[PDB]
Design a protein around this ligand. Sequence first.
Ligand SMILES: [Cl-]
Ligand SMILES: [Cl-]
Ligand SMILES: [Cl-]
Ligand SMILES: [Hg+2]
Ligand SMILES: [Hg+2]
Ligand code: NI
Ligand code: NI
Ligand code: NI
Length: 150
Amino acid sequence: SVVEYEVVSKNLTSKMSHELLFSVKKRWFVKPFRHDRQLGKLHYKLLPGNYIKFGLYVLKNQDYARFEIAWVHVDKDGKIEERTVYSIETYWHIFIDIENDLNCPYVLAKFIEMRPEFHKTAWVEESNYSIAEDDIQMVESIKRYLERKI
Ligand SMILES: [Cl-]
Ligand SMILES: [Cl-]
Ligand SMILES: [Cl-]
Ligand SMILES: [Hg+2]
Ligand SMILES: [Hg+2]
Ligand code: NI
Ligand code: NI
Ligand code: NI
């Protein structure tokens, strides 16, 4: 009744790759079942259904940050299908600062805040919390905010 799924979570001297899964149904981040700080991975066991993957890819020395949103579809038979629905490039110094914005989409600030510490992975606590926006409004709010910021 669950499917295994892996994403990248690592923060190294020169680069960071920070991915997390978000449950469409629950409207909050999915809790990983295992993290691998050695290989820099997060492992999930997923019920069939729809998920959003947030991805942040940073080259620190180039002051470069790419942010992506992907739709992840998980079927009964174990089949997983992924589609990128949004991608933007900007400076790391800008993207990192979103954290401190007084008004911006909460899910995005939370995502950034949860980035992996150096040589660790990004964890996600137990929760029954859900944001108020559905997946469409949520994504649109993120795009609108980043269009302005960038
Ligand atoms: Cl290193
Ligand atoms: Cl370099
Ligand atoms: Cl799909
Ligand atoms: Hg889907
Ligand atoms: Hg904010
Ligand atoms: Ni650990
Ligand atoms: Ni399907
Ligand atoms: Ni749109």
